[PDB]
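Morning!

As promised:
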Amino acid sequence: FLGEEDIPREPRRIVIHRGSTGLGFNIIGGEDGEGIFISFILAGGPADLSGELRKGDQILSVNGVDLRNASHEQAAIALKNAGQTVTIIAQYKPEEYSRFEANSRVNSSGRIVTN
Amino acid sequence: KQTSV
């Protein structure tokens, strides 16, 4: 059903209330421009419970701080020290993301498929 | 690099 509908590609604002716990996701990128992408969403974590983030999403900013051209560690530092309420502006970029994970590609609906 | 946050 849903899985055949196109994944929205416009930027989205996601407000996560995580208090003093991890956001519950992994980031890759931050080397030479690339950008910061979500590579994994932890089951049960705040990011998962938000139901608004997914692997392949690029983190454009955290609490107003532009992360488009952030380095890996600084981006991590920004997220970890973002505070209890984290406002992320994210944008689905599967083609860009697919470059990181082995044997991964994008299907007609924009879904990241790994072979 | 990959970091869990």
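Residues 1-115 of chain A form a domain with the Pdz3 Domain fold (CATH 2.30.42.10).

Hope this helps with the figure draft.
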